[PDB]
Design an enzyme around this catalytic site. Structure first.
Site, mmCIF file in Angstrom:
data_model
loop_
_atom_site.group_PDB
_atom_site.id
_atom_site.type_symbol
_atom_site.label_atom_id
_atom_site.label_comp_id
_atom_site.label_asym_id
_atom_site.label_seq_id
_atom_site.Cartn_x
_atom_site.Cartn_y
_atom_site.Cartn_z
ATOM 1 N N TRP A 109 -4.449 3.648 11.851
ATOM 2 C CA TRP A 109 -4.450 3.486 10.395
ATOM 3 C C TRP A 109 -4.999 4.804 9.805
ATOM 4 C CZ3 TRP A 109 -1.990 0.052 7.566
ATOM 5 C CH2 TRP A 109 -2.178 0.143 6.165
ATOM 6 N N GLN A 133 0.775 -1.237 0.000
ATOM 7 C CA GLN A 133 0.000 0.000 0.000
ATOM 8 C C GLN A 133 0.819 1.308 0.000
ATOM 9 O OE1 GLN A 133 -2.545 -1.630 3.430
ATOM 10 N NE2 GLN A 133 -3.943 -0.383 2.200
ATOM 11 N N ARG A 191 4.271 0.805 12.842
ATOM 12 C CA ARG A 191 4.020 -0.515 12.311
ATOM 13 C C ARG A 191 4.208 -0.486 10.810
ATOM 14 N NH1 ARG A 191 -1.472 -3.602 11.620
ATOM 15 N NH2 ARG A 191 -0.409 -5.492 10.774
ATOM 16 N N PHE A 239 -7.254 7.320 4.224
ATOM 17 C CA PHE A 239 -7.160 6.965 5.648
ATOM 18 C C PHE A 239 -6.086 7.714 6.453
ATOM 19 C CE2 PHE A 239 -9.832 3.548 7.053
ATOM 20 C CZ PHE A 239 -10.259 2.922 5.896
ATOM 21 N N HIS A 242 1.848 -9.082 5.191
ATOM 22 C CA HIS A 242 0.700 -8.207 4.948
ATOM 23 C C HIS A 242 0.241 -8.355 3.480
ATOM 24 C CE1 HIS A 242 -2.118 -4.920 5.501
ATOM 25 N NE2 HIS A 242 -1.595 -4.560 6.660
ATOM 26 N N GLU A 251 -4.475 -1.702 14.518
ATOM 27 C CA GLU A 251 -5.085 -0.749 13.548
ATOM 28 C C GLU A 251 -6.385 -0.227 14.098
ATOM 29 O OE1 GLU A 251 -5.726 -2.268 9.625
ATOM 30 O OE2 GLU A 251 -3.654 -3.114 9.498
ATOM 31 N N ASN A 278 -0.979 -10.423 9.159
ATOM 32 C CA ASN A 278 -2.033 -9.423 9.197
ATOM 33 C C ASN A 278 -3.361 -9.982 8.656
ATOM 34 O OD1 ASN A 278 -3.485 -6.869 7.537
ATOM 35 N ND2 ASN A 278 -2.685 -6.485 9.592
ATOM 36 N N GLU A 279 -4.374 -9.998 9.518
ATOM 37 C CA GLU A 279 -5.766 -10.333 9.167
ATOM 38 C C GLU A 279 -5.966 -11.599 8.336
ATOM 39 O OE1 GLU A 279 -7.899 -6.969 7.634
ATOM 40 O OE2 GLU A 279 -7.459 -5.682 9.403
ATOM 41 N N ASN A 284 -7.102 -5.376 15.013
ATOM 42 C CA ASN A 284 -7.416 -4.342 14.079
ATOM 43 C C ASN A 284 -8.912 -4.140 14.193
ATOM 44 O OD1 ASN A 284 -4.781 -4.664 13.316
ATOM 45 N ND2 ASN A 284 -5.221 -5.335 11.215
ATOM 46 N N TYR A 289 -12.319 -1.465 13.714
ATOM 47 C CA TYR A 289 -12.858 -0.247 13.118
ATOM 48 C C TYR A 289 -14.327 -0.013 13.482
ATOM 49 C CZ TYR A 289 -8.662 -0.275 10.194
ATOM 50 O OH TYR A 289 -7.361 -0.237 9.735
ATOM 51 N N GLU A 341 -5.602 1.788 -1.079
ATOM 52 C CA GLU A 341 -6.537 0.985 -0.296
ATOM 53 C C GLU A 341 -7.018 -0.288 -1.018
ATOM 54 O OE1 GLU A 341 -7.334 0.705 2.741
ATOM 55 O OE2 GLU A 341 -9.317 -0.149 2.843
ATOM 56 N N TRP A 342 -6.076 -1.108 -1.459
ATOM 57 C CA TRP A 342 -6.377 -2.391 -2.092
ATOM 58 C C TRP A 342 -7.364 -2.229 -3.275
ATOM 59 C CZ3 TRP A 342 -2.457 -5.207 -0.613
ATOM 60 C CH2 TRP A 342 -1.953 -5.124 0.713
HETATM 61 C C1 LIG Z 1 -11.750 -5.145 11.238
HETATM 62 C C2 LIG Z 1 -12.946 -5.746 10.560
HETATM 63 C C3 LIG Z 1 -13.276 -5.006 9.281
HETATM 64 C C4 LIG Z 1 -13.520 -6.013 8.175
HETATM 65 C C5 LIG Z 1 -13.007 -5.865 6.951
HETATM 66 C C6 LIG Z 1 -12.130 -4.691 6.599
HETATM 67 C C7 LIG Z 1 -10.699 -5.109 6.907
HETATM 68 C C8 LIG Z 1 -9.761 -3.913 6.960
HETATM 69 S S1 LIG Z 1 -8.353 -4.406 6.011
HETATM 70 C C9 LIG Z 1 -7.102 -3.626 7.056
HETATM 71 O O1 LIG Z 1 -7.383 -2.237 7.394
HETATM 72 C C10 LIG Z 1 -6.935 -1.163 6.553
HETATM 73 C C11 LIG Z 1 -8.060 -0.160 6.329
HETATM 74 O O2 LIG Z 1 -9.134 -0.762 5.600
HETATM 75 C C12 LIG Z 1 -6.346 -1.848 5.332
HETATM 76 O O3 LIG Z 1 -6.105 -0.951 4.251
HETATM 77 C C13 LIG Z 1 -5.123 -2.568 5.916
HETATM 78 O O4 LIG Z 1 -4.128 -2.886 4.953
HETATM 79 C C14 LIG Z 1 -5.671 -3.859 6.516
HETATM 80 O O5 LIG Z 1 -4.786 -4.360 7.548
#
Ligand SMILES: CCCCCCCCS[C@@H]1O[C@H](CO)[C@@H](O)[C@H](O)[C@H]1O
Length: 478
Positions: free
Chosen positions: A434, A21, A78, A450, A122, A384, A167-168, A309, A311, A441-442
């Site tokens: 984050w 990213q 990080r 962000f 990641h 995050e 990561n995730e 992580n 949100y 953003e993928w």
């Molecule tokens: C936490 C539950 C939310 C579910 C799905 C969304 C997952 C977020 S991906 C995560 O967060 C950033 C902001 O989106 C990415 O850009 C980072 O690279 C990645 O680590």
């Protein structure tokens, strides 16, 4: 409001980033192709037709960016190591230029008093491993990841003391292999016509199993060969939405708990208890792999800390269905739940730019207590937390900088974080926003901002401080 004093002594504040990213320089210094280079260069995969070939060019600009962190008084950063910069083909010949680059980054950070918290994986698997054996779908990934991890421990672990192996893994398993919306973009074609290959009912569970075994394998090497002398710690960053029951009725209360078990528990139950959640065993059946006794013994206990992580929070209802056979099996149906940010048509909160990101500060506190109670109070880092603005070409840069919503987001989530620690007894050790900069953003590409810093994609990636920069600087003052 909040100050450092609102948090335990030594509480760690940082910003977070990821290599694909941020870095760019995708073909520079021997870097191998990754599954995300392939995906970003495939029609239909990225919503805004963009790619991260240059991204925000942190590969060349990290010193400028480190001074931005130091400007705020950040304690830590990080960042991820791109596997394909170290082993361009995943295994085989080490790429010395990759080692030299990350040493410069690590040294530049420490020169400024900023601690490196390093993510080994990641999402940027070398395409060579995807080509050889379909990457995370093959058990070979376990040994290959462990060897890559060992090289990082050996090269950097004299200075790096906080490692996040993965990561995730939940996001990867579901987005990469159920929905096919993220690399390598696999799914049941009967469910989503855009996919080339896959099986939404089976592949996510295989991938998740391999992730868990891969962490355990890296952790085993770390503990046996590096940890005594280096004195560092290993963890994982889990993506975790909080789930509230859609109604205060026992059926929906059980549903929200079940959705949590299928999201966090899928990974965390093995790491703490040595097996998957009973509800997953019951509902996923033979599609869910079994650990051997020896595997369980290396997996149970393999975390030194839990990265979260977090949100957002959704409502969760019980769901009854009658699936039309194996063909349509998928992870969501397996949970026996449906989760949405809407109750009786009313959204759970204000929303950020991302369609999925609802602003629900209380869920931070509720989650910290869930982790405390379920897993016997392990050390947690918020690896995050943050929110995004749109990328809006119809407003001035000056106006793009007025991120009052972001300020309130961080203020409210951190207030709930502070309360979970001080009032509730949760062992939270640090917090990472984050993100430091706006970035790629993928599959959302540059459509999502962000960053604490605004990046001008139209003026050679110039970094401008949003209002949140001053807010963090004031929070972190000593
Ligand atoms: C936490 C539950 C939310 C579910 C799905 C969304 C997952 C977020 S991906 C995560 O967060 C950033 C902001 O989106 C990415 O850009 C980072 O690279 C990645 O680590």
């Amino acid at each position: 409001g909040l100050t450092r004093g609102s948090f335990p002594e030594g509480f760690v504040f940082g910003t977070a980033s990821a290599a694909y990213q941020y870095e760019g320089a995708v073909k520079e210094d021997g870097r191998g192709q990754t599954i995300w280079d392939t995906f970003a260069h495939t029609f239909g995969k990225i919503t805004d037709f963009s790619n991260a070939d240059v991204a925000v060019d942190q590969y060349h600009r990290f010193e400028e960016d480190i001074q931005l962190m130091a400007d705020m008084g950040m304690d830590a950063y990080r960042f991820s190591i791109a596997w394909s910069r170290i082993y361009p083909n995943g295994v085989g010949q080490v790429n010395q230029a990759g080692i030299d680059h990350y040493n410069k980054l690590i040294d530049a950070l420490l020169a400024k008093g900023i601690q490196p918290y390093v993510t080994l994986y990641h999402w940027d698997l070398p395409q060579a491993l995807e080509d050889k054996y379909k990457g995370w779908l093959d058990r070979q990934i376990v040994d290959d990841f462990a060897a890559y991890a060992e090289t990082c421990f050996r090269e950097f672990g004299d200075r790096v003391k906080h490692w996040i192996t993965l990561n995730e893994p939940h996001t990867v398993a579901i987005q990469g292999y159920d929905a096919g919306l993220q690399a390598p973009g696999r799914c049941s074609v009967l469910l989503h016509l855009y996919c080339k290959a896959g099986n939404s009912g089976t592949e996510p569970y295989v991938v998740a199993h391999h992730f868990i075994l891969a962490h355990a394998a890296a952790a085993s090497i770390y503990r046996t060969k590096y940890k005594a002398t280096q004195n560092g710690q290993l963890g994982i960053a889990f993506d975790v939405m909080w789930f509230e029951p859609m109604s205060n009725t026992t059926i929906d209360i059980e549903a929200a708990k079940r959705a949590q078990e299928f999201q966090l528990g899928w990974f965390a139950d093995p790491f703490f208890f040595g097996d998957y959640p009973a509800t997953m065993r019951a509902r996923v059946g033979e599609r869910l792999p079994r650990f051997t006794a020896d595997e369980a013994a290396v997996v149970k206990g393999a975390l030194d800390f839990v990265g979260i992580n977090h949100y957002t929070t959704y409502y969760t209802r019980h769901n009854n269905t009658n699936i039309i056979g194996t063909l349509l099996n998928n992870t969501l149906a397996d949970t026996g739940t449906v989760s949405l940010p809407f109750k009786n048509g009313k959204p759970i909160g204000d929303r950020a730019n991302s369609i999925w990101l609802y602003i629900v500060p209380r869920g931070m506190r509720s989650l910290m207590n869930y982790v405390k109670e379920r897993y016997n109070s392990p050390p947690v880092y918020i690896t995050e937390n943050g929110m995004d603005d749109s990328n809006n070409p119809f407003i001035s840069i000056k106006d793009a900088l007025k991120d009052s919503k972001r300020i309130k987001y961080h203020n409210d989530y951190l207030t709930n974080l502070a309360a979970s620690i001080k009032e509730d007894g949760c062992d939270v050790r640090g917090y990472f926003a984050w993100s430091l900069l706006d970035n790629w953003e993928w599959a959302a590409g540059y459509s999502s901002r962000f960053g604490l810093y605004f990046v001008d994609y139209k003026d050679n990636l110039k970094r401008y401080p949003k209002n949140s920069v001053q807010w963090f600087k004031a929070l972190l003052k000593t």
